[PDB]
Design a protein around this nucleic acid. Structure first.
Ligand SMILES: NC[C@@H]1O[C@H](O[C@H]2[C@@H](O)[C@H](O[C@@H]3[C@@H](O)[C@H](N)C[C@H](N)[C@H]3O[C@H]3O[C@H](CO)[C@@H](O)[C@H](O)[C@H]3N)O[C@@H]2CO)[C@H](N)[C@@H](O)[C@@H]1O
Ligand SMILES: [K+]
Ligand SMILES: [K+]
Ligand SMILES: [K+]
Ligand SMILES: [K+]
Ligand SMILES: [K+]
Ligand SMILES: [K+]
Ligand SMILES: [K+]
Ligand SMILES: [K+]
Ligand SMILES: [K+]
Ligand SMILES: [K+]
Ligand SMILES: [K+]
Ligand SMILES: [K+]
Ligand SMILES: [K+]
Ligand SMILES: [K+]
Ligand SMILES: [K+]
Ligand SMILES: [K+]
Ligand SMILES: [K+]
Ligand SMILES: [K+]
Ligand SMILES: [K+]
Ligand SMILES: [K+]
Ligand SMILES: [K+]
Ligand SMILES: [K+]
Ligand SMILES: [K+]
Ligand SMILES: [Mg+2]
Ligand SMILES: [Mg+2]
Ligand SMILES: [Mg+2]
Ligand SMILES: [Mg+2]
Ligand SMILES: [Mg+2]
Ligand SMILES: [Mg+2]
Ligand SMILES: [Mg+2]
Ligand SMILES: [Mg+2]
Ligand SMILES: [Mg+2]
Ligand SMILES: [Mg+2]
Ligand SMILES: [Mg+2]
Ligand SMILES: [Mg+2]
Ligand SMILES: [Mg+2]
Ligand SMILES: [Mg+2]
Ligand SMILES: [Mg+2]
Ligand SMILES: [Mg+2]
Ligand SMILES: [Mg+2]
Ligand SMILES: [Mg+2]
Ligand SMILES: [Mg+2]
Ligand SMILES: [Mg+2]
Ligand SMILES: [Mg+2]
Ligand SMILES: [Mg+2]
Ligand SMILES: [Mg+2]
Ligand SMILES: [Mg+2]
Ligand SMILES: [Mg+2]
Ligand SMILES: [Mg+2]
Ligand SMILES: [Mg+2]
Ligand SMILES: [Mg+2]
Ligand SMILES: [Mg+2]
Ligand SMILES: [Mg+2]
Ligand SMILES: [Mg+2]
Ligand SMILES: [Mg+2]
Ligand SMILES: [Mg+2]
Ligand SMILES: [Mg+2]
Ligand SMILES: [Mg+2]
Ligand SMILES: [Mg+2]
Ligand SMILES: [Mg+2]
Ligand SMILES: [Mg+2]
Ligand SMILES: [Mg+2]
Ligand SMILES: [Mg+2]
Ligand SMILES: [Mg+2]
Ligand SMILES: [Mg+2]
Ligand SMILES: [Mg+2]
Ligand SMILES: [Mg+2]
Ligand SMILES: [Mg+2]
Ligand SMILES: [Mg+2]
Ligand SMILES: [Mg+2]
Ligand SMILES: [Mg+2]
Ligand SMILES: [Mg+2]
Ligand SMILES: [Mg+2]
Ligand SMILES: [Mg+2]
Ligand SMILES: [Mg+2]
Ligand SMILES: [Mg+2]
Ligand SMILES: [Mg+2]
Ligand SMILES: [Mg+2]
Ligand SMILES: [Mg+2]
Ligand SMILES: [Mg+2]
Ligand SMILES: [Mg+2]
Ligand SMILES: [Mg+2]
Ligand SMILES: [Mg+2]
Ligand SMILES: [Mg+2]
Ligand SMILES: [Mg+2]
Ligand SMILES: [Mg+2]
Ligand SMILES: [Mg+2]
Ligand SMILES: [Mg+2]
Ligand SMILES: [Mg+2]
Ligand SMILES: [Mg+2]
Ligand SMILES: [Mg+2]
Ligand SMILES: [Mg+2]
Ligand SMILES: [Mg+2]
Ligand SMILES: [Mg+2]
Ligand SMILES: [Mg+2]
Ligand SMILES: [Mg+2]
Ligand SMILES: [Mg+2]
Ligand SMILES: [Mg+2]
Ligand SMILES: [Mg+2]
Ligand SMILES: [Mg+2]
Ligand SMILES: [Mg+2]
Ligand SMILES: [Mg+2]
Ligand SMILES: [Mg+2]
Ligand SMILES: [Mg+2]
Ligand SMILES: [Mg+2]
Ligand SMILES: [Mg+2]
Ligand SMILES: [Mg+2]
Ligand SMILES: [Mg+2]
Ligand SMILES: [Mg+2]
Ligand SMILES: [Mg+2]
Ligand SMILES: [Mg+2]
Ligand SMILES: [Mg+2]
Ligand SMILES: [Mg+2]
Ligand SMILES: [Mg+2]
Ligand SMILES: [Mg+2]
Ligand SMILES: [Mg+2]
Ligand SMILES: [Mg+2]
Ligand SMILES: [Mg+2]
Ligand SMILES: [Mg+2]
Ligand SMILES: [Mg+2]
Ligand SMILES: [Mg+2]
Ligand SMILES: [Mg+2]
Ligand SMILES: [Mg+2]
Ligand SMILES: [Mg+2]
Ligand SMILES: [Mg+2]
Ligand SMILES: [Mg+2]
Ligand SMILES: [Mg+2]
Ligand SMILES: [Mg+2]
Ligand SMILES: [Mg+2]
Ligand SMILES: [Mg+2]
Ligand SMILES: [Mg+2]
Ligand SMILES: [Mg+2]
Ligand SMILES: [Mg+2]
Ligand SMILES: [Mg+2]
Ligand SMILES: [Mg+2]
Ligand SMILES: [Mg+2]
Ligand SMILES: [Mg+2]
Ligand SMILES: [Mg+2]
Ligand SMILES: [Mg+2]
Ligand SMILES: [Mg+2]
Ligand SMILES: [Mg+2]
Ligand SMILES: [Mg+2]
Ligand SMILES: [Mg+2]
Ligand SMILES: [Mg+2]
Ligand SMILES: [Mg+2]
Ligand SMILES: [Mg+2]
Ligand SMILES: [Mg+2]
Ligand SMILES: [Mg+2]
Lengths: 124, 138
RNA sequence: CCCUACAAGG
RNA sequence: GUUAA
RNA sequence: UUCCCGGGCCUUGUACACACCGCCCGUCACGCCAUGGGAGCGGGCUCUACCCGAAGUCGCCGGGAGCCUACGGGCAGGCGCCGAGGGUAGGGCCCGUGACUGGGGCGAAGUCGUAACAAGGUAGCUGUACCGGAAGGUGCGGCUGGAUCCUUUCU
RNA sequence: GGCUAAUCCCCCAUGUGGACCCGCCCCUUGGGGUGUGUCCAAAGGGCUUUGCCCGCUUCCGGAUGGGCCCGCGUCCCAUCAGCUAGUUGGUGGGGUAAUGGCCCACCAAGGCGACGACGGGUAGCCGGUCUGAGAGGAUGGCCGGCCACAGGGGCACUGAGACACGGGCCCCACUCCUACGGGAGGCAGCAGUUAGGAAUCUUCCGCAAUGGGCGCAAGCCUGACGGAGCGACGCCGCUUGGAGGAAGAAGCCCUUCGGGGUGUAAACUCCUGAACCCGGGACGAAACCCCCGACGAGGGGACUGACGGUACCGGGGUAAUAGCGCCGGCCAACUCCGUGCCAGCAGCCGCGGUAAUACGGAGGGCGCGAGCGUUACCCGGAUUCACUGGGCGUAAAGGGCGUGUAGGCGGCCUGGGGCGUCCCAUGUGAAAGACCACGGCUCAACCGUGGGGGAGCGUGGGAUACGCUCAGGCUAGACGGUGGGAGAGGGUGGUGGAAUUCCCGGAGUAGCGGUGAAAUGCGCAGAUACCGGGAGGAACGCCGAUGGCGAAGGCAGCCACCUGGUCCACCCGUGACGCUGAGGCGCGAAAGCGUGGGGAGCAAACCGGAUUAGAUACCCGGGUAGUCCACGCCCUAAACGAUGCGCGCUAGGUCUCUGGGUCUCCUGGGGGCCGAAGCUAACGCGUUAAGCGCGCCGCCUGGGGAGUACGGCCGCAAGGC
């Protein structure tokens, strides 16, 4: 565009949309489990992915993933959401943090333990 | 009617040199002549001269080029490899003496029109003055 | 479990 | 009928 | 050597490339989710008109109605304008809900046909118009982003 | 109701002086001087008591602090475009320290806005901070500056200062106390409670130091502050050991069962000594005060430490925490088993379907280490809003075309001014921070001192090339003159022949029509085919082109009239009168809409015949709107060269339309093809540019959702922007 046009209209700073409306852009959000479902992945994949419908303190009710093999969540389990979507589950944009609230840490987990919330087992 | 008689000249020169013409004419004007003075002095062109084309005043600009060359495409290197307008109608470019650019570490030049007359970037720096940054050459 | 890892069929 | 090589 | 089957060479179109037994469109069915319209129903803001109007400053009175007085004046008190807010009527605006209602996104293997890509089997696309389970079909005009010199879907 | 003191209040006097009216002078907005008139002062207390200290009154000035005013700068939405009555200005008042519609009386009719008013949304602003090569982007916590607020709203009183967080009054909400009349209260001070939240600490010590208020002083107050406590929240420093030690224990993992790995790692030997334990033990603190001196200078003297028995010293002295992420590519690091599109991983690409370096465990490995990961957010990479530093023929992007308003841009020469621009000097640019140097804590973090910075803005002076402005000149752009030219350019009227349909007459008879084949249909009320006549509507064969004209849409028989554009020649006139163009306005294929008319042929819909698995189609027979005209709407498009307009520049060849010329050919305007240089991702473009440049407009910014929803504007509607 001409310089005159640039003087007349300038450029437009374009902003980005959040991939995570956990309101306050808080790093995490608390909520209660409304439903504990199972969901099928998209095309390339097949499996019974574990998801939960959570009613947030942020006034939102979004579905969150329940990572790990374990899992002990029911229709009233209070839990902490963190954000991190699931490439396979369109609509699932948050992960439930294991080891916090009513969400038990994955038991017998021996590797990436800090994720999955699993304390260190005694070695001898 | 031209909108940038200066830009016009830099281009007539640019286009001509690109086809290895011996010389090229440009509508006459003092300011334009002054710029030509430097190109000559700086050895970018053989030189120039007033002439009258069909009754009107022009300026034959005698172009320079390197020697014929080796292999394929024996066309000679250009003396004036780059001649570019900086300040322009509706975007004039002005610089203070500490803002005069250094074209190609000195290998090239800048031509400003100062209140002390048209000067190469060195001539300007020397006389300690800035002005309108007309163009750049190398 | 028969097909080919499945779907669907027996 | 789907997904692969 | 026109035709059926397999094949070789040149060329052309292609949205095909585990390569036409390719690709692929829309309706509909099942599941998840966001969302538009929306009578009525409540919450708030705002503008206009009129009305009521605390405190307080200011202005007038301050009288044979009160207090002080060195008679000049002062205080109390009274009245008024402005005035936080409030009321009634009307107009605009926003938020929540919302019967009923429109379409949309997304989710390996459900249903119907086959619209498009090769002249895709009636060249396609297009603005508009009517019409039809659906893709679409047809009219009129336009564009090339069109191949060349009985009939038949799928995968 | 009564009594009473003062540095409380008042009257009189003195008037250095000051205030006010009027005059004059100087100066220039209300600044300074001067004259007359008028008006205005005061507080006492202490004693080392005949003279000092604290203090009071008036005035001028200083210093510090502040009020008000002005230039410039300060986020998003134009789906916010018109806003305004104290509104804009005046005169005269009120108010204040003071200007001012700050407030009022009256008069005038003004003020503001596309350089974005008004409305809506969001937000305290800076020094700085983070990031970035820079330009820039993001940000404003701690510290410093300014502002604003003190439960919400309004208000004034006191005072130098407030319209006052721990002052006052009223209204509102809320809490508490009430004998129900009526009262009390405001932690956005320190700490602490509770609620909300992913989340943020002690109801600590001290007033020793620095700083503040009151006091002559002693000294009193100070949750300001100086410290301690809690939290890996961050940064920096430190530890968990050092040297020796086997061709190499065991265990565990691989294996080709030979052996390879963990690995000098361990064990074990020796050495040093984090912790701890003793003893010493701070700096921060020397003033105020007191004595001498003169309550000065100067000199002596005394008191005082929260932190803390801490830091730091010296002695003794134990071998004494390691975790977390990761290992398919990006990206450093591979094997075994389990599992079998399951369970699960996943930042993006992707991985798992029975031998998975990608899942889960293990061995091994890589990375970092009192941390390591994750999530969230900011800058970067992203020249991915491109000023530096991008684009639009086919990738997203040229507006359907023109006219032209504001605006942006502007040929050659001379002169004035000196706004832009450039130069010098100078003022400003607080501290902290950043940078460099040196220095203080054993280092560092942290901190001290010093050095250097600049943009921006103010002031004075200077320059004049370019841009600007004024003045004059010019003729190369532009426009005009005269003379010629070609054209389906437009509008109105008239008019010609071919064909179809229909009607009439003649003649003639059994079918015609239609298809792949058929049938519907039409025909003995005589069709088809043929001849003659008539009516009507619509469109113009050959010429005709790869042609011409127009801004696009688009325009085609012939004639007349009215009318637009354009090209060449002659160099005749004007003398930069130019280019572009937001908005506006006009034009704008087809279909469609309204009123009226027309209606031959064609033909959405529709009625039928076929075809087909079906056939809401393609083929066949009919057929309404419509197609045509007038007038008014609609405003779209593959409105396309998918290429905005103007100008200058950069080989040619060939065909062609139209004009001029000394007419092999030269010169101008237009239409094509191939190609120089160059450009392009390529295809291609290439003097009719997509090349080289300048000016202006329009537009793009991943795909779907969606040209949808909402709002506005327009339309009768369909619907358009
Ligand atoms: N998301 C697709 C959108 O909706 C339409 O597509 C939707 C349907 O038409 C389509 O349906 C297909 C069907 O066409 C096809 N013949 C069979 C197939 N099983 C269906 O599939 C659908 O349903 C199954 C469950 O039954 C899901 O697992 C699957 O993900 C889903 N796409 O699947 C889509 C639903 O996701 C439009 N045609 C498409 O252009 C548009 O983008
Ligand atoms: K034959
Ligand atoms: K006097
Ligand atoms: K003073
Ligand atoms: K001041
Ligand atoms: K006034
Ligand atoms: K800022
Ligand atoms: K800033
Ligand atoms: K002394
Ligand atoms: K020691
Ligand atoms: K040890
Ligand atoms: K197995
Ligand atoms: K593995
Ligand atoms: K980023
Ligand atoms: K377009
Ligand atoms: K338009
Ligand atoms: K001059
Ligand atoms: K003419
Ligand atoms: K018959
Ligand atoms: K043509
Ligand atoms: K009609
Ligand atoms: K090329
Ligand atoms: K609308
Ligand atoms: K309307
Ligand atoms: Mg920019
Ligand atoms: Mg898979
Ligand atoms: Mg993530
Ligand atoms: Mg140039
Ligand atoms: Mg150049
Ligand atoms: Mg099937
Ligand atoms: Mg699969
Ligand atoms: Mg064959
Ligand atoms: Mg052969
Ligand atoms: Mg072929
Ligand atoms: Mg090919
Ligand atoms: Mg395939
Ligand atoms: Mg009233
Ligand atoms: Mg009152
Ligand atoms: Mg009174
Ligand atoms: Mg009111
Ligand atoms: Mg709603
Ligand atoms: Mg419905
Ligand atoms: Mg699913
Ligand atoms: Mg079709
Ligand atoms: Mg088809
Ligand atoms: Mg087929
Ligand atoms: Mg057909
Ligand atoms: Mg077809
Ligand atoms: Mg159509
Ligand atoms: Mg039809
Ligand atoms: Mg057509
Ligand atoms: Mg085509
Ligand atoms: Mg069929
Ligand atoms: Mg099918
Ligand atoms: Mg087939
Ligand atoms: Mg009394
Ligand atoms: Mg007395
Ligand atoms: Mg007194
Ligand atoms: Mg006197
Ligand atoms: Mg006197
Ligand atoms: Mg005066
Ligand atoms: Mg005077
Ligand atoms: Mg006097
Ligand atoms: Mg007196
Ligand atoms: Mg006044
Ligand atoms: Mg006054
Ligand atoms: Mg006012
Ligand atoms: Mg505003
Ligand atoms: Mg705020
Ligand atoms: Mg950058
Ligand atoms: Mg601060
Ligand atoms: Mg307030
Ligand atoms: Mg509060
Ligand atoms: Mg209050
Ligand atoms: Mg208040
Ligand atoms: Mg107050
Ligand atoms: Mg308080
Ligand atoms: Mg809580
Ligand atoms: Mg603290
Ligand atoms: Mg103190
Ligand atoms: Mg003190
Ligand atoms: Mg106290
Ligand atoms: Mg402190
Ligand atoms: Mg913390
Ligand atoms: Mg060792
Ligand atoms: Mg000790
Ligand atoms: Mg000392
Ligand atoms: Mg000390
Ligand atoms: Mg003391
Ligand atoms: Mg003495
Ligand atoms: Mg002393
Ligand atoms: Mg020892
Ligand atoms: Mg690697
Ligand atoms: Mg398993
Ligand atoms: Mg992992
Ligand atoms: Mg991996
Ligand atoms: Mg550390
Ligand atoms: Mg950038
Ligand atoms: Mg971007
Ligand atoms: Mg740019
Ligand atoms: Mg780009
Ligand atoms: Mg396309
Ligand atoms: Mg495109
Ligand atoms: Mg165009
Ligand atoms: Mg203009
Ligand atoms: Mg000029
Ligand atoms: Mg101008
Ligand atoms: Mg100047
Ligand atoms: Mg400075
Ligand atoms: Mg300066
Ligand atoms: Mg500084
Ligand atoms: Mg040091
Ligand atoms: Mg410093
Ligand atoms: Mg100056
Ligand atoms: Mg001048
Ligand atoms: Mg002139
Ligand atoms: Mg002349
Ligand atoms: Mg003429
Ligand atoms: Mg014509
Ligand atoms: Mg007859
Ligand atoms: Mg007869
Ligand atoms: Mg019959
Ligand atoms: Mg008969
Ligand atoms: Mg006849
Ligand atoms: Mg008729
Ligand atoms: Mg033309
Ligand atoms: Mg056309
Ligand atoms: Mg002439
Ligand atoms: Mg124009
Ligand atoms: Mg039209
Ligand atoms: Mg029409
Ligand atoms: Mg009509
Ligand atoms: Mg009609
Ligand atoms: Mg017909
Ligand atoms: Mg049938
Ligand atoms: Mg038909
Ligand atoms: Mg076209
Ligand atoms: Mg344009
Ligand atoms: Mg040519
Ligand atoms: Mg030509
Ligand atoms: Mg020609
Ligand atoms: Mg080339
Ligand atoms: Mg070419
Ligand atoms: Mg050009
Ligand atoms: Mg191009
Ligand atoms: Mg657009
Ligand atoms: Mg779209
Ligand atoms: Mg539309
Ligand atoms: Mg439409």
């Amino acid at each position: 565009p001409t310089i005159n046009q640039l003087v007349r209209k300038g450029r437009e700073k374009v902003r980005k949309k959040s991939k995570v409306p956990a309101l306050k852009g808080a790093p995490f959000r608390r909520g209660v489990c409304t439903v504990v479902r199972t969901v099928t992945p998209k095309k390339p994949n097949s499996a019974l992915r574990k998801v939960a419908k959570v009613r947030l303190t942020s006034g939102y009710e979004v579905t969150a993933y329940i990572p790990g093999e374990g899992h002990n969540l029911q229709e009233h389990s209070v839990v902490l959401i963190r954000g991190g979507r699931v490439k396979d589950l369109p609509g699932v944009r948050y992960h439930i943090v294991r080891g916090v609230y009513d969400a038990a840490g994955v038991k017998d987990r021996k590797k990436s333990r800090s994720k999955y919330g699993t304390k260190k087992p005694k070695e001898a | 009617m031209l909108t940038d008689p200066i830009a016009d000249m830099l281009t007539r020169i640019r286009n001509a040199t690109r086809v290895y013409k011996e010389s090229t004419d440009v509508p006459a004007s003092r300011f334009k002549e002054e710029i030509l003075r430097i190109l000559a002095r700086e050895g970018f062109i053989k030189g120039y001269e007033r002439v009258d084309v069909d009754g009107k005043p022009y300026l034959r600009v005698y172009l320079k080029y390197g020697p014929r060359r080796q292999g394929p495409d024996p066309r000679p290197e250009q003396v004036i490899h780059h001649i570019r307008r900086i300040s322009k109608p509706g975007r004039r470019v002005y610089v203070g003496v500490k803002e005069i650019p250094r074209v190609r570490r000195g290998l090239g030049i800048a031509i400003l029109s100062t209140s002390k007359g048209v000067l190469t970037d060195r001539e300007a720096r020397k006389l300690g003055v800035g002005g309108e940054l007309i163009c750049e050459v190398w």
